């Protein structure tokens, strides 16, 4: 599947040693399926695969 | 979480305060004063009749 329009909002952040951030992303998809996620920076690490 | 406030010495008037903690929704408290009493320390000297 493909996704065409998205935006980002960040309601909370605390730079602790644990997972202290949450983010919400909107998307529009052409059809049902699975997709992978990945960060493009080195200072931020993401739990979900 | 520790919070400190100051209230004037007036009976029969409600007051409100705001508690703000990062990462959580705000909370509002309401307080009202009903009575204040003073009591001295006494010592007897003599009596008359």
Number of strands of chain A: 2
**What topology, given as strand order, has the largest sheet of chain A?**
1-2
Give the assembly state of these chains: part of a larger assembly
Q: Over the alpha carbons, how many angstroms does the gyration radius of chain A reach?
A: 13 Å
> Helical stretch count of chain A?
0
Distance between the termini of chain A: 17 Å
- The amount of helix of chain A comes to under 10%
Indicate the proportion of strand residues of chain A. 25-35%
What is the general shape of chain A? elongated
Main sheet properties of chain A: 2 strands, antiparallel
Give the class of chain A from helix and strand content and strand pairing.
mainly beta
Order of secondary-structure elements of chain A: EE
Summed up, what is this model?
The structure is cut from a larger assembly and holds 2 copies of chain A (49 residues). The first copy, chain A, is mostly beta strands.
What this model shows, in words?
This is part of a larger assembly, with two copies of chain A (49 residues). The first copy, chain A, is mostly beta strands and 49 residues long. The first copy, chain A, has no helices and two strands. A two-stranded antiparallel ribbon of chain A has the order 1-2. In chain A, a hairpin with a 7-residue loop joins β1 (7-13) and β2 (21-26). Chain A is elongated, with a radius of gyration of 13 Å. The chains hardly touch. The PDB classes it as viral protein/immune system.
